[PDB]
RNA sequence: GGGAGACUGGAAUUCCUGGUGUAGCGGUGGAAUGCGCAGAUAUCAGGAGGAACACCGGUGGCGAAGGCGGGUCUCUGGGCAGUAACUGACGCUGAGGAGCGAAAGCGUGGGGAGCGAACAGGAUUAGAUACCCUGGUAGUCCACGCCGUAAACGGUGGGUACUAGGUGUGGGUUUCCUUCCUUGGGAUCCGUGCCGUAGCUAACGCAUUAAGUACCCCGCCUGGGGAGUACGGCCGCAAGGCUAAAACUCAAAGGAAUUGACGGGGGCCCGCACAAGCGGCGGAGCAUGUGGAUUAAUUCGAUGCAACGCGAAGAACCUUAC
């Protein structure tokens, strides 16, 4: 296939992972 | 393509003590020479390599003169 | 010169002396497009050599040529950003051309004020090895056996 | 001192070239390097600088009374043969030439590859 | 080189100690930080320590996959071939479930030569939180446990039977030449590559190791984003992993091949392109043209090669448009 599709998937995953790292302490406070 | 001298009925058995046979299959720098040059089969080339290493450890052959 | 070797021009024989050397010399010394001056200059130099050395001009000219004819030359070839001065043997034609070129080139740096005795004097010196072009000839030989370090490329 | 037979160690790298004249027992009596003869930067990686360094080392060892030399040459060749010829030209004698380049048996980890 | 344990060998890098020995070494497209002159680099001799095992060594062997080569010993798993003595359908697949599972990462305790995220300088640049250079912590290594993911790929689930061949190679049995050595050749079983029919495919291509012809069982798919995300739940020390939507939004997103164009992609062939030679320009004075600056205007156009003795083959008034 092409690598455009993998590129879209990796861009979305990278943004989500960065967001998940940015709010670690707030999530830890809320969940527990 | 040559024949394996050990596969013939008159091929000597391979031992790490008998260092002349091993000197036959090592180059002037002490390295083991490729199986294409010697022409011997897979099993006997493996035997020769193991014997050369064993003789090298007991200091009967040099470690790459 | 990309397709193949170029044709070689014929050389007209001299009517006065009968050797191609003098006509080659007058061609080499020719300047600005005046033949007549050129052969009169070279003939005056020949006659002054005649009256000075006491021997024939042809034999002393050939002896001077042999004393100036080189056998090896230097060619510059670049690779990987480094230029190497490979020594190369010389075809006889290039040797003769270089000898005449060197003689005429060192004919023009003298102080003795006119061309004919300049040429005669250097002919005598090259016959005896006292010239300036000869100095460059043994210099070229000195770098020929000096720059032997770059010969395995063979270019 | 007067040692009539010594040894020459030529180490040629991609950035320099250094020649050391030693006694047959490993004591240096004269050394010269490609930047010791007046070269800087990249210019000391050239064969010409190797020639000059070899000539200078040969002369300084010669004034100590050295006649014949065994050559142990080493490193990724940049000015090896030029150094050999410069030793021969400067009035020395080269008896034997041997390449002694350190060869690992796959130990240690080389640095990452440039890009 | 299938796995686990113990002992052990040599080359090389680093550091320390001692000789000889000097003023440079290192690095790069070029340099500078950096190391030395308090004795560096280099060359000898001795010692300490850790990690990986040149040559043999390959599209070659083994393993269910991940993966496995310095030597020796100890313990142990799978495969193939021949004989066919033995049991007598005991077979295949397998929802959930369990076990193994590269690298990175986590916990406790060791170890630490080389390399090297993060971090400091130097250089490049309009700027360089990068590429290049000099240092360098976790980590890489060992013991015992967590995690459970990879472009974990043949992007090809397992079992079985049939369908032209040619030619390499690994393991084993047999017959004909028999010299009884040899890839001597043939036959047969089990692997591993290339080429090729029929057949299949949208095409590329697969082709007895099928993506062909058929039967049994499992997993999965139903336009692209939102999204493998949210809520709920389970697991984990943590990082996070597994199960898994909707509102909304677009009229497409895709796969293969074809013709051009382009490449800071290649290969051949030409040309005064280089080379081999002769004569010049850039240095001086002068004539033109242009850029720039002044004033009333210094009329307008031309502006890498392909503008600069060009429109202009003729500016005192005229020309001339200022």
Curated annotation (Swiss-Prot), chain B:
The keyword Cytoplasm does not apply. Belongs to the bacterial ribosomal protein bS18 family. The chain holds residues 17 to 81 of 84 of the full protein. Signal peptide: none annotated. One of its GO terms (cellular component) is cytosolic small ribosomal subunit. Keywords: Ribonucleoprotein, Ribosomal protein, RNA-binding, rRNA-binding. This is Small ribosomal subunit protein bS18B. It comes from Mycolicibacterium smegmatis (strain ATCC 700084 / mc(2)155) (Mycobacterium smegmatis). GO terms for biological process: translation. One of its GO terms (molecular function) is structural constituent of ribosome. The lineage of its organism: Bacteria, Bacillati, Actinomycetota, Actinomycetes, Mycobacteriales. Part of the 30S ribosomal subunit. Forms a tight heterodimer with protein bS6.
UniProtKB/Swiss-Prot annotation, chain C:
Pfam families: Ribosomal_S7 (PF00177). InterPro entries: Ribosomal_uS7 (IPR000235), Ribosomal_uS7_bac/org-type (IPR005717), Ribosomal_uS7_CS (IPR020606), Ribosomal_uS7_dom (IPR023798), Ribosomal_uS7_dom_sf (IPR036823). CDD domains: uS7_Bacteria. Coiled coil: none annotated. The keyword Ribonucleoprotein applies. The keyword Mitochondrion does not apply. It comes from the Bacteria. Part of the 30S ribosomal subunit. Contacts proteins S9 and S11. Belongs to the universal ribosomal protein uS7 family. This is Small ribosomal subunit protein uS7.
Swiss-Prot record, chain D:
GO terms for cellular component: ribonucleoprotein complex; ribosome. GO terms for biological process: translation. The keyword Ribonucleoprotein applies. It comes from the Bacteria. GO terms for molecular function: rRNA binding; structural constituent of ribosome. Keywords: Ribonucleoprotein, Ribosomal protein, RNA-binding, rRNA-binding. Residues 97-115 are annotated as: Disordered. Belongs to the universal ribosomal protein uS11 family. Located on the platform of the 30S subunit, it bridges several disparate RNA helices of the 16S rRNA. Forms part of the Shine-Dalgarno cleft in the 70S ribosome. Part of the 30S ribosomal subunit. Interacts with proteins S7 and S18. Binds to IF-3. This is Small ribosomal subunit protein uS11. It comes from Mycolicibacterium smegmatis (strain ATCC 700084 / mc(2)155).
